[PDB]
Each structure stands twice: as structure tokens, then as C-alpha cells.
């Protein structure tokens, strides 16, 4: 290690196109991260590359933390989590940049 953290934030409002995912995010919102892990922004020249890594690193950490407590994510959770983390990673790239 390590990775850099972002500050905890309010989990973002997201209008998912898939209606059932839209409702599922709201019902189960607290299952998802409210902060991101990443490699330093100044190691990237492009938002898209930063966000890709920020998503992979954050989802990895969150899934590992969850599995070792004996909890689980559904396939739906994973789809939503990736979107939520993407948004927070973008916010982190833009703020931090
Ligand atoms: Cl929240
Ligand atoms: Na709930």
C-alpha cells in the first residue's frame, strides 16, 4: 500500500435507467461505499483512466471487506455499486484536480 482515500460523502442521487435497479439502489443504499480508494490523481493525464482504476480498487476493497465479515453482495448490488463508485470517483477526480 497504499491507496489514497477520498473523504466520505453523501451517497449520490442517481436515476438508473433500469427501473428495478433504480428502486433497488434506494432500498439498499447503505450497502454501497460512501468513499473511494484510488491512486494519486497526478499519476493520471486522463479522467477516464483514473476513474477506471478508482472503480476497480474501490469495488475490490468493498467486496473484500464485506466477504470477510460473512456478508454478500447480489449481482444487482454489484451493478449498482459500480455506478455509484464511478460517480464518486468522477467527483474525486474533478475536486482533487
Ligand atoms: Cl449516504
Ligand atoms: Na434497506
Numbering used by the authors: 126 to 222
Q: What does the article say, verbatim?
A:
Pathogenesis in prion disease involves refolding of the host protein, PrP, from the monomeric, primarily α-helical cellular form (PrPC) to a β-sheet enriched, aggregated infectious form (PrPSc). Additionally we found that rabbits, a species with low susceptibility to prion disease possess PrP with a helix-capping motif in the β2−α2 loop, which appears to hamper the formation of the β-state. In the previously determined structure of wild-type rabbit PrPC 121–230, the sidechain of S174 forms a hydrogen bond with the backbone of N171 and vice versa, creating a hydrophobic staple helix cap motif. To test this hypothesis, we introduced the single mutations S170N and S174N as well as the double mutation S170N/S174N into rabbit PrPC 121–230, successively changing the rabbit sequence in the β2−α2 loop to that of wild-type hamster PrPC.
The structures of the S170N, S174N and S170N/S174N mutants of rabbit PrPC 121–230 were solved by x-ray crystallography to resolutions of 1.4 Å, 1.6 Å and 1.5 Å, respectively. The structures of the three rabbit PrPC 121–230 mutants show the same dimeric arrangement of PrP in the asymmetric unit that was observed in the wild-type structure published previously. The overall folds of the three rabbit PrPC 121–230 mutants (S170N, S174N and S170N/S174N) are very similar to the wild-type structure. In the crystal structure of the rabbit S174N mutant PrPC, the mutated N174 no longer hydrogen bonds with the backbone of N171, ablating the reciprocal interactions forming the helix cap and leaving the backbone of N171 exposed to solvent. The S170N single mutation reduced the rabbit PrPC ΔG of unfolding to 5.9 kJ/mol, while the S174N change and the S170N/S174N double mutant displayed ΔGs of 5.45 and 5.7 kJ/mol, respectively. At pH 5.0, no β-state forms in the S170N mutant, whereas the S174N rabbit PrP begins to form the β-state to a maximum of 12.6% and the S170N/S174N double mutant forms a maximum of 37%. At pH 4.5, the S170N and S174N single mutants form 54% and 66.6% β-state and the double mutant sees a larger increase to 84.9% β-state. Many susceptible species have asparagine at positions 170 and 174; by mutating the rabbit PrPC serines to asparagines we have shown that interactions involving serine-174 in the rabbit PrPC helix-cap are disrupted suggesting that this motif may be absent in PrPC from species that are more susceptible to prion disease. In support of this idea, Vorberg et al. showed that the N173S mutation in mouse PrP (equivalent to rabbit residue 174) imparts resistance against the RML strain of scrapie prions in a neuroblastoma cell culture model. The result of our urea denaturation experiments involving wild-type rabbit PrP and several of its mutants show that disruption of the helix-cap reduces the folding stability of PrPC.
